[PDB]
Design a protein around this nucleic acid. Structure first.
Length: 60
DNA sequence: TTAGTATATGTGCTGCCGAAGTTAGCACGCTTTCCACAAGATATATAAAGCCAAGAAATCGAAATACTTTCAAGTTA
């Protein structure tokens, strides 16, 4: 893995990690967040969505 | 034709600094576009309550006067 990933998904993951580190959440929280983000990205409706949509996806 | 001279001939010398390799015994431990597919942005009840900002009324806070008290100095005695 980490090779069949788009630049948009990579930016989303990096934003997730950045917000996690800003809120100072543990690495377990970081891992759970990235896992849930990947699980949500698996779907196509969220995959091909808006920029604000994917930002709110990071947030949620 | 022969002695003197210039060249390259490979050879052998010198340093040249660097090259590999060495050093003993346990326990712990980014950009352009380009691209195509599907997702904004759109009417429309629709009951429901909570929220977020103008107005209108209300009462709290208190300030400028109206009463009473109080002295203190002065009166009829």
């Amino acid at each position: 893995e980490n090779e069949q990933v788009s630049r948009s998904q990579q930016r989303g993951l990096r934003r997730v990690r950045d917000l996690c580190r800003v809120l100072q959440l543990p690495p377990t929280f970081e891992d759970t967040a990235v896992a849930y983000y990947q699980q949500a990205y698996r779907h196509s409706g969220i995959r091909a969505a808006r920029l604000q949509k994917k930002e709110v996806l990071v947030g949620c």
